[PDB]
Structures are given as C-alpha cells and as structure tokens.
C-alpha cells in the first residue's frame, strides 16, 4: 500500500498476476489450478529473462570466457 | 472438461423438510406459480366483472333458469339477479345481512331458498319474479345453516324464542311432489318432522355437506354422518370422526367421492371410513404460523374441478386487522402439490358458468399480442367450462379469475427459489460455469446464482442476469461455492411455461 | 487420500438392540431432544402461566363458553374458573378431593359436569354462574369414572351404601332435547336406564374412552366394547382383548381412528379389531425398569396433534419417594420414533387453548434476540394452535408449554451419543480427521470423540471441541480407534436444528 507502484508491474503485469493465482490457489488447497497458474507464472519469469538475455547480440559472447590458463 | 446436471419437472412447494434435504425436484421457496403437468406456469389473473351492479356483495351462487344462467348475489340488506347484462333487483324489503350473518342458499323442489341468521328464509318459486318469506316457518325461530337433503330440509344452530342452542338438527317433514315442506312441528307424531340434540361434546354444530349417500356433520371437534333409513325413524346418526373436526363455515368440499376438510390445527382428506393428513411434512408448520389472529374466521375453500385444484383462502399476518382474506394455498389432488398465491382481499367465492360478454371481432383487442391469449378457434365464452369468481366486500369489486395475465392491468412478480444444492459432495468447492432454462412463451425471466459456505448460513448472491424466452439459450456466469442456490424471478406481460433446467459445471476448485 | 461418510437425518432413540447393530441413522442414548421432520430439535420449554391463583391445582380442563376459551380448574377442595386474565372461584361450598380422588369431568346437553370418587357429581348450567348439584342423583353413591356417551351418562366403578362394586357400568335413562337425565332407577321397566356387570376376571374397570362410534371399557387386564343399539337393550357388549388392559386413568387416548394405549407391561395401538405393539425393541426394556415401585399409578398420556406427538409421562427412579412424574417419553407416531425428556415435578397436564395475553410492541421485549423467537408476523396468541398446560401440585405451579427456550429462566442441556460404528470393518484401525455437522441456527455445541477397541468395553474419550453454529464449518481433531463414538452436547439460550453430520477419517493405520 505505502508502494503503490514499481517498475516490474508496470513492464509485465501478467507475472504477478499468474504469481497471485497461484499463491491463492495454493491457499485454497487446489492441486491441479495451482500446478498449472506456477508453470504459466514460470513460463513468463523465463520469457522475461530471455528477453533481457537477447538485447544486444555482441554481448552474448562476451563475459562467458574469462580466464582460463 | 464440462460436467452437467439435468433437473426435469420441479414441481411443488415444501417448507417443513430444510432445504438440503429436498429431492432435486422440489422447490424451497415460491410465490405467485401453478404447477400443473408437471410444469410451472404464472398464476391466474383476475378481471373486473359485472361493474353495474350497486352496493358490496356478500355471498354468490350460480344457476340456471330457464336454459339460461344466472347468479344470485346476496347483498348486505338486498338480493340481485345477474345475467352477464344486467342487474335486477328481486329483494322483497330490508334484510339485516353482515358479516357475521352470512348466507346459506341452494335448490329443493323446484325452488330456490335462500337465509342468514337473522331474518326468516326466503323461497323463490319458478312462476314469481321475487323472493316471498318461507310459508310454515316457525315464528321466532332462526336457523345458522339451512340445507336440503333427498326430500327434507335441514336447520342447524337454531336459536328459538331468544334461547339459543347450537347442537340441535331440526328436520322437516317429506312433503314429496313439488313444493315446500308443509310443517315442522316434531311434537307431530302422525308426520315425520322431528329433531336430535347432538350433545356429547362442548363442541357446536358449524356445517353440514353431502357425500356419497349421507350428511356429513361437522361439529368443532368431531365429525357425525347422518342417513336416511324412512321407518319409524326416518334418519340414523353414526359418529365418525372424534379428534378432529372444521375450522368454519364453507371449509369442507368433496370431490372423487372424498371430502377435503380444512380442521383446526390440521388440513386432512376422508372417505368417511379412513382419514389421513394432506398438509402434513410440506407446508404445515408454515401454514399454522401465516393465520392472523384476529381473523382466524373468514378462511374457506373452494375447488376447481377443471383445474383439478383446492384453494384455501385466508388472511395472513401481513394485513392489519379487520382486512378480509388476501391469502391462498392452492393443493393439487392429482400431483399431490402445493402453491402460494396472492389475493385482492376478497371475501366469498363461486364457482360457476359466467357468460363475460365480450365481442371477439378484430378492431375491438386491447391486450396486445404478448398477453397469455388462447388458442386460435377459442372465443371469450366457454359454455363447457366453469370459471371463479370472487368479492371484495371493502372494496365493492367482483373479479373473474382466468383468462387475463394481469391484477387487473396491474403486474406482478412470480417467484421461484430453491438452495442447499451440493450433489451429493459437500467438501469440494464447485464451480458452476452456466444455467441452461426449458422455458416456452414469452417474456423475460431474470436468474439469480448464489453460494453458501455452511448449510443453512448466509448466501452470497450473484446480480441478476436477464433471460429472453424463446431466443436465448442459456446465461453464463462463474460462481464457486460450497451450497448452490437458485432464484428465478417472472416479470408479467407474457405467458410462459417452465418444466426443469440444467446446471453446466466447471472442474471443482479445491475444498476450502 | 480422504474418505468421507455421510450421516442423513439420524432420529430415534433406541436401546434394547445393541449399539452395534444399529442402522448408521439411530442415536443410541439421548436427553431433551425432539424428531420432527428428520430434524432433532431442542425440547419445548415451560413459562410459568396463571400466576394468580391460590391453592394448589388437581385437574384442568380447558373449554369454550360465550365465544370464549375458559379454563376450570379443579383443586384440591375449590373449583376455580380463568379466562387468561381473572380467576374466579365458582365451587358451592368445600369438596373432599386428594390425590387418590381424582376429578372426571365434561359436557352433556351444554351442561358441564364435574365428579370426584368422595362427592355427589355437580353440574353448570349455561344460566347460573356456579356449580349445583347433580338433581336425581341416588343416596349415598359415589362413582369413580363418569362420562357421556351420546344421549346418555355413565357411571363406572361404583360405591352405594357403603359397599363397592367395581366391575358395574351404570347408564341413566336418555335424554330429550336437552337437560339432565331425569332418573336413574334401573328396577324401573319403563325406562332405559340400567346396568352391567363385566365379572369374569379378577381386574377392575379402570377407565372409558369412545372410539368411533362405540365406547372402549378398559379393565386391569382386558378391553371390552359396548354400543347402543336401542331397541329392547339399549346398549350391547362385546369383549375385544383378554391378554392386555391398561395402567391406570388417563393412559388411553385417541388419534387418527386408533387407539393408544399404555398396559401393564406393554404400550400398544389397537383399532378395535387388530391390536399392535410400538414400543417393543426400541425402548421397551428401558421403560419398564425406570418406574418408581411406589409410585407407578401417576402415570399419564397427553396428545400433541399439531405436533403429532404422545407424551408418557411418569415418575423415574432418579426421584425419592413420594414425588410426581418427573420424566417422559415422546412417541411421533408419523415416523416411529421414541425421545427422551425431563418434567418439572408435574401432576396432570391439559391440552387447549390459551391467551398468555403478552404485549408485542418494541419496548416490552425481555430474552434477547438468540432465544427461540418466532416468525415476524406471528404474536403472543395464535387461536388457531392449541398448547399443553402441566400443573404442579406439590410446587402450586402452573407451566405453558411452547415458545421459550428456558426451564423457566434456567437453562437445561441437550444430549445425543451414537457408539459403535465401524463401517463394516471390524479389524483395522481408523484415523477420523474431522467432523463436520449439519446444524442451523444459533448457540455453541460441544463435540466428544471417543475409540473403543472391544465391541461393549469402555471407551477413552477425547476433550469437548466447541463449535459456534453458523459461523464455524468443521472441528479438527486426531483420534486412532477400532470402534467409532460421538456425543454431542447442546446448551441452552438457542435455538437449533440438527439434520445429520460427515466424519472425514484418513488412510487407516494398521490392524492393531
């Protein structure tokens, strides 16, 4: 309440909207809805992710070499 | 991945057993329904009839004269005759009529009579145009209840020389071909008119109705039968019934060679050899709790044989006293089903042919297409069929009940609700994904959805959800929830029939 | 991983078949509960009524004079007459009643009698305003029982000139129109009055009861039956059972054509022809070992026909010597079944019509909102129900039974306790997670869960778990046992309704 508002609710809402689903229907004791909102809340993390992965090409091959002797 | 659940022909009202352990098919609550056929359909309208006459009207009883029909309409201190046109006076002068000196009426020999308990009774013969006092009646002597039976007339509730005694049958002598009875002297031992006192219980003597080939005599507590075997006693009394008797006057109807009675305390059905309860573990305790106290004495019934139905009107506790009846339960012999209704505080009612008068053509039909109607060859006069009709008394009315679907022009709701639903599984949460209706007509319905978390608690309702007859197929909603409850609510302007539903169900959502 | 098993409108109590082998829908002990409609109920509570009138009370009889209900109490040596509101002495001058003469009483021709086995009989005539009595009555001749029977009196047990007969039925002449019977002299051939004498067993005539349209006559050991015929004879007698006869007065009432009857060693129905116990393998064993040995003849039968009910009411073992009934047992006999209530040390009761005369307004409400209450619409007097008045004699006490929900202000407890259940498995062990019980209304239960691991051994029971009606939906618990055992225990200031209850139990946990 005292932080309405954050940068990841502004990029992607349909994380913690998946993440809540799936808090509540962890709560209400609910196995199949459950399993299914936490893959779909982990597909969205991994998407997120890949998509930070991919912004710049040139980067991708560098800092993974490092040092080896 | 979509379950589904048929509910076909709910039918009837039941309030005594608690909701949760009703059959599928039975409703928990309603207002303002038939069930018939196994369907449910909107409640008869009334329209205003014979507004020409003056003056309120007590009681009314049909008949036919001279190939025609007409209904005799006992007013407060003068009688009127009506043929569906006009209205004539036959009084002969000032009766002493009212509410508490009702009026008892019927046919002997030919001739009509007609009394209340305060004034000597009046005869009407086929060749006068006019009612004349009864000729041989006794000076002094007033009757509660007159009736014929075979060749005799019947007294009952007789106050003489300003003594009164309620427990004494008075009957007169055979007086066969034609006309009325020539004495009623018993002290006579060379005739056959004679007297019994029916004195064994501090119950009196309230009505008296035919049945099968006997008199059946209703005290307030016990129930006599009385026959006919000529000889040197002319009748036989035989007591039938000792725990139980009537609540009032006009509260005992036959039907099927069976007598519906409404006692005190209980609603029941006889033969006159084995009696059982037909109120009992569906509306009773509902019943006996809705009777105004101060007017536990206008209720009667009466019976719709085309119909098949029973109708017990009363007054129930949401009028203040003194008002009329403007209540009734309705119980159908055949389906074994009951039904509440309301009423426009009325006081007596008939059950008869009644020509309205209305011309069909074409330019001459208000009431537009969406109105009940009838069927095509139909007119506005059914000559083999019967038709009620009522009288409000305050409010100087006299209404026939049938074809029209409004109170007069007036709307109404109609309502239908049932809850505690679970299946058989009340752990799981389910989910109820739509309501599939089977209603034929037209009109617009509205559906409520609602959840319960523990039996009997609070319920959580879902906003009204419109439903057009005839077009729309079902109504999506999404309601989890432990108790599924149901409400339908018919708004008027249309006739509609409505004979079961269905429930279409997501996967259940957990258990807490 | 949880089973579920569902209990469905468990009623009835019932202890001679071993809790083991009951149906799953029985209670095997219970206190102060009420079956109705496949509901346990708590049991009616009493408010003291009449609380200004002096001396102790013997007898009551309730009845309807001038359009409105009276009450006559018979003392124990000064009739008293209430209307609700004033209690007016109206005995001649000063009878020698006890508790071992007690008051017959009823009407004839609208006269009311009244009789004592140590006084001459008195009547009431609808003119005077006391009692006088009995003209014609024969010199020094006292009877035990004395009622009416059509057009004629009876007198049963007799005393004349210092010397009883007790196997006498004495009928007085018929009477006409109206008045007492005008003799009594049975020498006389002129006239219809006579005798009888039942003598062929050693039993003595204990009490009269009509049934239909003939006159039940019960002995300490037979049942005979005698109807009027007229003629030469007036009256003809048939013996009907020799195996069986009855307790004591007041132990024989009627309902629906039959006969309910409380014999010596059996409770019975009989219609005259066909003859049939009900309380044989339900509580048959525990009724007759609770009677007090000195005090087995206070004994009675009262009828609740709204309710559909018949109280026996006696004095338990729990009770010293000398004390009235204190204990009761309630037969439905709509759907078979036996409960269990304590009295207020009562002596006779009487069902009736009554006005508490209760203002309703708003600010005249003592007993806050969670006690009982009724419908809104529904008042203080409803005429069209009757009610269940006990008197306690030893107290000086009169109670109205109904409405509240207290023992006059005190609070009393509810008890229902099912053993034994096993679900058809006899050798592994169960686990029972939760109990989730079906109750509306308002209050706090308590719930007991106890194992047993030898059918008919003692049983370790665990603490009481409270559950608030309405709010809460289960109770969670832990209990590995072989034999299931539950008991619920109800509280008082509520009002409740209990149609069934689901124990959820996990996977079992070994067969030791």
């Not at chain 2, 979509?2 to 309603?30: C, H, M, Y």
């Amino acid at each position: 309440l005292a932080n309405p508002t954050t940068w990841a609710l502004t990029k992607y809402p349909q994380i913690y909207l998946y993440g809540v689903l799936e808090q509540i229907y962890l709560y209400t004791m609910d196995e199949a809805r459950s399993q299914f909102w936490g893959q779909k809340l982990e597909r969205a993390v991994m998407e997120l992710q890949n998509e930070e992965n991919a912004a710049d090409f040139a980067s991708t091959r560098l800092a993974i070499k490092d040092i080896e002797r | 991945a979509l379950e589904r659940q048929e509910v076909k022909n709910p039918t009837g009202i039941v309030t005594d057993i608690a909701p949760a352990d009703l059959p599928l098919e039975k409703w928990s609550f309603g207002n303002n329904v038939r069930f018939k056929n196994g369907k449910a359909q909107k409640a008869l309208g009334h329209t205003p009839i014979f507004d020409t006459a003056q003056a309120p009207i007590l009681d009314m009883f049909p008949f036919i004269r001279n190939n025609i029909p007409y209904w005799l309409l006992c007013g407060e201190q003068r009688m009127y005759l009506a043929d569906g046109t006009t209205v004539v006076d036959v009084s002969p002068g000032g009766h002493s009529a009212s509410v508490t000196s009702r009026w008892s009426s019927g046919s002997f020999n030919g001739v009509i009579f007609a009394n209340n308990p305060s004034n000597y009774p009046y005869v009407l013969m086929p060749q006068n145009s006019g009612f004349i006092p009864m000729p041989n009646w006794p000076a002094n002597t007033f009757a509660k209840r007159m009736k014929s039976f075979k060749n005799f007339m019947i007294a009952l509730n007789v106050t003489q020389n300003s003594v009164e005694m309620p427990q004494m049958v008075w009957w007169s002598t055979s007086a066969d071909a034609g006309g009325i009875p020539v004495s009623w002297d018993p002290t006579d031992p060379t005739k056959d008119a004679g007297q019994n006192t029916l004195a064994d219980t501090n119950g009196a003597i309230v009505d008296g109705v035919k049945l099968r080939d006997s008199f059946i005599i209703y005290k307030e507590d016990s129930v006599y039968s009385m026959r006919y075997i000529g000889g040197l006693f002319i009748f036989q009394f035989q007591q039938l019934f000792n725990d139980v008797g009537i609540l009032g006057p006009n509260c005992a109807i036959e039907f099927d060679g069976n007598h519906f009675v409404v006692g005190h305390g209980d609603v029941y059905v006889h033969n006159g050899v084995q009696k059982q309860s037909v109120i009992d573990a569906q509306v009773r305790k509902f019943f006996f709790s809705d009777i105004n106290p101060d007017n536990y004495q206008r209720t009667f019934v009466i019976a719709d044989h085309v119909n098949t139905e029973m109708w017990v009107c009363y007054s129930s506790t949401r009028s203040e006293p003194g008002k009329h009846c403007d209540r009734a339960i309705i119980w159908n012999w055949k389906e074994n089903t009951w039904s509440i209704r309301d009423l426009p505080n009325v006081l007596s009612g008939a059950y008869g042919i009644i020509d309205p008068k209305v011309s069909n053509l074409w330019d001459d039909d208000p009431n537009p297409w969406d109105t009940y109607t009838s069927v095509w060859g139909e007119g506005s006069y059914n000559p083999a069929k019967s038709s009620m009709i009522f009288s409000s008394f305050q409010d100087k009315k006299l209404f026939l009940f049938g074809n029209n679907s409004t109170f007069s022009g007036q709307n109404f709701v109609s309502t239908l609700e049932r809850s505690d639903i679970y299946l058989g599984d009340d752990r799981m949460m389910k989910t109820v994904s739509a309501i599939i209706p089977h209603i034929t007509g037209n009109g617009t319905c509205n559906i409520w959805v609602g959840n319960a978390q523990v039996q009997g608690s609070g319920i959580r309702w879902k906003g009204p959800y419109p439903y057009r007859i005839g077009q729309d197929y079902k109504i999506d909603t999404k309601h989890v929830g432990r108790y599924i409850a149901l409400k339908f609510d018919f708004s008027s302007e249309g006739d509609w029939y409505f004979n079961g539903y269905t429930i279409e169900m997501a996967p259940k959502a957990g258990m807490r």
